[PDB]
Write a protein that binds this ligand. Structure first.
Ligand SMILES: *[C@@H]1O[C@H](CO)[C@@H](O)[C@H](O)[C@H]1NC(C)=O
Ligand SMILES: *[C@@H]1O[C@H](CO)[C@@H](O)[C@H](O)[C@H]1NC(C)=O
Ligand SMILES: *[C@@H]1O[C@H](CO)[C@@H](O)[C@H](O)[C@H]1NC(C)=O
Ligand SMILES: *[C@@H]1O[C@H](CO)[C@@H](O)[C@H](O)[C@H]1NC(C)=O
Ligand SMILES: *[C@@H]1O[C@H](CO)[C@@H](O)[C@H](O)[C@H]1NC(C)=O
Ligand SMILES: *[C@@H]1O[C@H](CO)[C@@H](O)[C@H](O)[C@H]1NC(C)=O
Ligand SMILES: *[C@@H]1O[C@H](CO)[C@@H](O)[C@H](O)[C@H]1NC(C)=O
Ligand SMILES: *[C@@H]1O[C@H](CO)[C@@H](O)[C@H](O)[C@H]1NC(C)=O
Ligand SMILES: *[C@@H]1O[C@H](CO)[C@@H](O)[C@H](O)[C@H]1NC(C)=O
Lengths: 327, 226, 98, 294, 142, 49, 42
């Protein structure tokens, strides 16, 4: 029982790799330059210094993981992106030509606000992310340029157009994408001559398969939802700073300046103590949550490196390794 | 709120485009002002975001003002660890603030303030130098870095990209191969915390130290230690 | 305190190595103040200052909103024996606002 | 039914609002889609044109719990045509009318034993001048000893009259007619205040809400702010000295003619209880999509 | 005292699942490219790993991969596959390697280093042709 | 648990149908476990398989 | 729906013969059909 009709379905899988490397301050976030807070934060001291050193170390762990996965994806040899790549294959959406079109529409489709990497203060001047000081924390610009990422994606894209023929991760003998995917279809167990008497038909069904997803990028595709869920989890992480100033936890008011401008020393001593314990416990739980997500991200990025190493730059061997059935 | 002497420097226009403080008669803090058209209900004048922060205000003359709040400089400072070169970086902002109007406690300029406008923002304590180091371990955001090198000042550098060996794709049946002609043996070493130190302690010495009043009072919680 | 002790505010260091310490402590300090919401007339607290002070079971309360309060002319006409405040302060009679 | 998802009857927030955000908020809220406490106002009996006996209900002796405030819809059945309440054979247009309120913490029996009598200081609200004025007082009511009066002989019930030929004519408004109509039964003692309000007259249906709390009585009306939308916007604050636990509606009658009896809408009243809603504020700031949690 | 012992046991537990997954992965590592020589890209060793070594340690395991790393990449001219014009079905596909033309003419080189050597049947297979191949009739392999 | 005030969630799929999956797998592993490929079915007798 | 608790819940137009292996259903109708692409598992 073997079928007489075949299509190429598209499976969409997203794996979160890099949490935005958010950093928070003992001085500015916690204390906000209030003199009784200034003279009371120090005898706590080692608590917040320990947790910010911990987030520094976790951020550096993320950084070295990013460096390792770049070293994994850095092909030693690569081919430039050529006009008319694929021949009969109208792969216009995938090509990179600063930014690639497919990831550009993914950026637009996913609800993303600009994280002010070039005129962020000017963006705050003219018109959430700008609340980065309002709640009080600081996320760095990423380890790489957007063009650095573009170079990495173009490098891997050029590599996999050629390394889908022969094992050996050292030399590069880039095949044209047509002959490459003919040999790939020979690898999955389909003979050449049926493909060779139907170049135009397989090309047309290949192009509609590669045009399926950007038409199908909507609420039905679960991968776009899990991308948005990862984004919403980062938003909940920053909200866990934003709302928790308002969360008094037995205190009076969120505004620490109003706390100190109202309350007398023999009672603002206990009130600022309530403030500092509430905020230190919330930050302890917070850094615990993203350290858990840090090793989760480490294992996830390792698995993503394996996925781009197995069914992207080679022919896979695990049954349904990265695709529903025969990838 | 109680009254005050007003003069001119109390208007929104008197401090437009400035990181100032606000006291909207109880809604107090530090804010910024920007001129905006009528957004939201005019009668309220007290509009908050999803996270309880004022985002605008309808002035008495009828001009609306977006409250994006007194976001500070995005604060960073870097120190090349235990080589005496530390300098400050200002995230995605111009050098409109200088080494005059600070507070905190103090800031040390060391030798000799001075704009170092960069793609990451405004840097103080550096000097511009188009340097390209690929293996640097002192990143400064995006693609910015610094040179370790070998009583002065610290120089600027970029996170370089190692370009791969470029091979031209050929539509013809002939093709050009890129081949390594020299070999080495890189050593990749890793460590895995397979076994933790198997450490135990009981509740009568760590938690009680064998004191008898302690021993009888500990049994009230009892099975907790168990 | 200066810039470099601020880095070494938790441990002790040495001479020459490579290492990132992006931890920081400064801020862009305010240089301006606004004290309006619109306008305000003074709420008359003379009804508290006048009239018969009623009994403890018949305490008379007055509410004030959308106006001005001047405590400088009020406690000057008082002789306070004691002034305590649970989770608020006596010193905040006319500084903070609600 | 009253549909919160159709933006029917949602009290505007007190001192803070949003823009294009969906968020929950606690407060005092009614139940979604209720039967309410529907009452209609019918004109009195007429033989031609001459003033005759009333035509009112036993709603003057029916009471509902104040709970935590109540809201009233005005003109929902208006701008239509239905049967006249007093004249079933007559089908006429439906015109908006406004209700009179009485509030207190005590319910007792009348002179004839029927329940509804209120002790101590009572909050009385009354629309007047064809609904233009909003007269009110938290003062002491005193019934009189005449015929068909609550402290006098032949007492049956109470209502308020209206002669629009003398009141709703050009100008006039007949020396606050409706206030003296209520005072045709009653007198005022130990009084505190007299507040008036200035409201135009139209034929567009509207919402209203009234509540009380430790910072006084508060009245919310959409006539002041939102016509094309409509939400209970705070406009009035009354200096009450206690907490009110009961509310009731004064029935109103009209000295109509017999031939052209024009009926009025059946207004609805909904009680308020502590609850939470979810509000989806758009960019304008008007309450156009909200929903219950219970 | 006891709630920082609660905390202690709680984080001991966290390190326990961490070390359980670590031990699972580590015994996987000592199985794959330590006992046999697997073909995964960077999964146990960065770069093209060759040999691995395992040592215990009083809190875990230290792993030493020594693997070939390339240098001095140069451009030469290779091919994809040679099939006869008259007999297209006869093709030679190099097993884990690539072609070269030197004419000491087609010869074999590996997939890692510039090691040319003549066409031998011992490191090639026979596969059916395609539309984009190369034909020759002047000098052919046995 | 309802006495305790909570509800464990039941299997959203029935026992006999995961039994059907496991039977299908027992049939399948003979078919796939002879030559690489996931398309067809190649049921060897389990002795020979 | 006789011996209930809590506050409020309603039902649209017609307690049908809905005795299923999971239990009993309110608001459905008896129909045994095949779904090989179920997305909302009842
Ligand atoms: C396979 O099915 C698709 C979808 O109906 C159809 O368009 C196509 O022509 C079929 N191909 C063959 C070879 O039957
Ligand atoms: C290729 O695809 C793009 C996007 O769908 C389209 O605009 C363009 O016309 C296509 N070109 C050809 C030759 O089909
Ligand atoms: C730094 O110097 C280079 C070389 O002179 C120049 O191209 C570049 O614009 C300079 N950077 C800035 C920010 O001006
Ligand atoms: C390969 O490179 C290393 C790097 O220093 C060098 O020592 C060695 O001599 C080189 N070998 C050849 C054959 O070029
Ligand atoms: C309001 O929110 C909707 C929902 O995302 C959005 O489409 C719309 O653009 C927003 N309004 C404005 C003025 O941006
Ligand atoms: C309006 O009512 C008041 C009662 O508060 C009454 O004193 C006054 O005379 C009335 N107005 C006129 C014009 O009579
Ligand atoms: C008003 O009522 C209060 C309540 O008993 C009473 O004390 C007061 O004397 C009354 N005022 C009069 C009768 O003028
Ligand atoms: C009340 O409304 C009438 C309508 O004609 C107007 O003449 C009058 O000035 C208004 N009074 C106030 C106090 O708004
Ligand atoms: C539906 O009807 C069939 C046939 O009478 C019966 O076997 C089945 O149990 C019914 N289902 C339910 C849920 O009552």
């Amino acid at each position: 029982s073997i079928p007489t009709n075949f299509s190429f379905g598209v499976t969409q899988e997203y794996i979160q790799t890099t949490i935005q490397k958010v950093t928070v301050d003992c001085k500015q976030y916690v204390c906000n330059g209030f003199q009784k807070c200034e003279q009371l934060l120090r005898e706590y001291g080692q608590f917040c210094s320990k947790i910010n050193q911990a987030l520094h170390g976790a951020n550096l762990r993320q950084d070295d993981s990013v460096r390792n996965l770049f070293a994994s994806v850095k092909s030693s040899q690569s081919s430039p992106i050529i006009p008319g790549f694929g021949g009969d294959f109208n792969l216009t959406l995938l090509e990179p030509v600063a930014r690639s079109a497919i990831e550009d529409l993914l950026f637009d489709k996913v609800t993303i606000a600009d994280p002010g990497y070039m005129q962020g203060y000017d963006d705050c001047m003219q018109q959430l992310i700008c609340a980065q000081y309002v709640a009080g924390y600081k996320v760095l610009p990423p380890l790489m340029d957007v063009n650095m990422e573009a170079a990495y994606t173009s490098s891997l894209l050029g590599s996999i157009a050629g390394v889908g023929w022969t094992a050996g991760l050292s030399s590069f003998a880039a095949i044209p994408f047509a002959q490459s995917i003919f040999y790939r279809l020979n690898g999955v167990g389909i003979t050449q001559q049926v493909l060779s008497e139907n170049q135009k038909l397989i090309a047309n069904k290949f192009n509609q398969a590669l045009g399926a997803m950007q038409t199908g990028f909507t609420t039905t595709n679960e991968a776009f939802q899990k991308v948005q869920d990862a984004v919403n989890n980062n938003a909940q992480a920053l909200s866990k700073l934003a709302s928790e100033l308002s969360n008094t936890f037995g205190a009076i008011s969120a505004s620490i300046g109003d706390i100190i401008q109202r309350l007398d020393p023999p009672e603002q001593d206990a009130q600022i103590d309530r403030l500092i314990n509430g905020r230190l416990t919330t930050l302890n739980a917070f850094v615990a949550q993203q350290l858990v997500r840090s090793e989760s991200a480490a294992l996830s990025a390792q698995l993503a490196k394996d996925k781009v190493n197995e069914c992207v730059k080679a022919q896979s061997k695990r049954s349904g390794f990265c695709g529903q059935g025969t990838h | 709120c109680p009254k005050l002497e007003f003069a001119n420097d109390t208007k929104i226009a008197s401090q437009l485009g400035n990181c100032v403080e606000y006291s909207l008669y109880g809604v107090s803090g530090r804010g910024v002002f920007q001129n905006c058209t009528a957004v939201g209900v005019r009668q309220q004048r007290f509009v908050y975001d999803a996270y309880q922060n004022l985002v605008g205000y309808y002035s008495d003359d009828g001009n609306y003002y977006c409250l994006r709040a007194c976001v500070s400089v995005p604060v960073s400072v870097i120190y090349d660890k235990e080589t005496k070169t530390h300098a400050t970086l200002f995230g995605s902002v111009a050098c409109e603030h200088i080494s005059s109007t600070m507070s905190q406690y103090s800031r040390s300029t060391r030798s000799m303030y001075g704009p170092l406008q960069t793609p990451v923002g405004c840097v103080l304590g550096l000097v511009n130098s188009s340097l390209f180091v690929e293996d640097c371990k002192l990143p400064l955001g995006q693609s910015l870095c610094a040179l370790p090198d070998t009583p002065g000042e610290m120089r600027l550098a970029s996170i370089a990209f190692n370009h791969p060996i470029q091979v031209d794709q050929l539509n013809s049946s002939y093709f050009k191969l890129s081949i390594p002609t020299n070999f080495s043996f890189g050593v990749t070493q890793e460590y895995i915390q397979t076994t933790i130190q198997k450490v135990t302690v009981d509740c009568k010495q760590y938690v009680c130290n064998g004191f008898q009043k302690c021993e009888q009072l500990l049994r009230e919680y009892g099975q907790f230690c168990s | 305190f200066n810039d470099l002790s601020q880095l070494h505010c938790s441990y002790e260091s040495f001479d020459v190595e490579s290492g990132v310490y992006s931890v920081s402590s400064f801020e862009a300090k305010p240089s301006g103040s606004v004290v309006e919401q619109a306008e305000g007339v003074e709420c008359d607290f003379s009804p508290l200052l006048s009239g018969t002070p009623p009994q403890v079971y018949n305490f008379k309360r007055l509410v004030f909103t959308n106006c001005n309060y001047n405590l400088t002319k009020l406690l000057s006409l008082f002789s306070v024996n004691d002034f305590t405040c649970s989770q608020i302060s006596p010193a905040a009679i006319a500084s903070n606002c609600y | 039914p009253i549909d919160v998802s159709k933006a029917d009857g949602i009290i505007y927030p007190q001192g803070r609002t949003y823009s294009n955000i969906t968020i929950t908020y606690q407060g005092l809220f009614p139940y979604q889609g209720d039967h309410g406490d529907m009452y209609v106002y019918s004109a009195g009996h007429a033989t031609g044109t001459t003033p005759q006996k009333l035509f009112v209900a036993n709603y003057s002796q029916d009471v509902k719990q104040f709970a935590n405030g109540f809201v009233v819809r005005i003109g929902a059945a208006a701008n239509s045509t239905g049967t006249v309440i007093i004249s079933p054979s007559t089908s006429a247009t439906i015109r908006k009318i406004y209700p009179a309120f009485m509030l207190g913490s005590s319910v007792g029996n009348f002179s004839d034993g029927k329940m509804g009598r209120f002790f101590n200081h009572t909050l009385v609200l009354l629309p007047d001048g064809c609904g233009t004025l909003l007269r009110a007082f938290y003062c002491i009511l005193e019934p009189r000893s005449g015929n068909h009066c609550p402290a006098g002989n032949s007492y049956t019930s109470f209502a308020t009259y209206h002669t629009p030929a003398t009141d709703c004519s050009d100008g006039n408004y007949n020396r606050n007619a409706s206030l003296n109509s209520f005072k045709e039964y009653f007198n005022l003692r130990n009084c505190t205040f007299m507040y008036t309000y200035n409201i135009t007259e139209d034929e567009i249906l509207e919402w209203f809400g009234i509540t009380q709390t430790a910072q006084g009585v508060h009245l919310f009306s959409s006539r002041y702010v939102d016509l094309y939308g409509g939400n209970m916007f705070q406009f009035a604050t009354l200096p009450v000295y206690d907490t009110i636990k009961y509310y009731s509606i004064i029935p109103h009658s009209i000295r109509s003619i017999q031939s052209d009896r024009k009926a009025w809408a059946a207004f609805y009243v909904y009680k308020l209880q502590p609850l939470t809603f979810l509000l989806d504020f758009s960019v304008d700031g008007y309450i156009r999509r909200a929903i219950d949690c219970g | 005292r006891l709630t920082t012992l609660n905390a202690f046991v709680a984080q001991q537990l966290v390190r326990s699942e961490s070390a359980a997954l670590s031990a699972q992965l580590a015994k996987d590592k000592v199985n794959e490219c330590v006992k046999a020589q697997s073909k995964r890209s960077g999964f146990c060793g960065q770069g093209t790993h060759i040999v691995s070594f395992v040592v215990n340690a009083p809190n875990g395991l230290y792993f030493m991969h020594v693997g070939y790393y390339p240098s001095n990449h140069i451009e030469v001219v290779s091919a994809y596959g040679l099939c006869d014009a008259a007999n297209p079905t006869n093709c030679i596909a190099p097993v884990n390697g690539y072609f070269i033309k030197t004419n000491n003419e087609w010869s074999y080189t590996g997939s890692s280093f510039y090691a040319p050597e003549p066409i031998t049947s011992l490191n090639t297979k026979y596969v059916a042709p395609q539309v984009t191949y190369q034909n020759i009739s002047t000098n052919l392999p046995p």
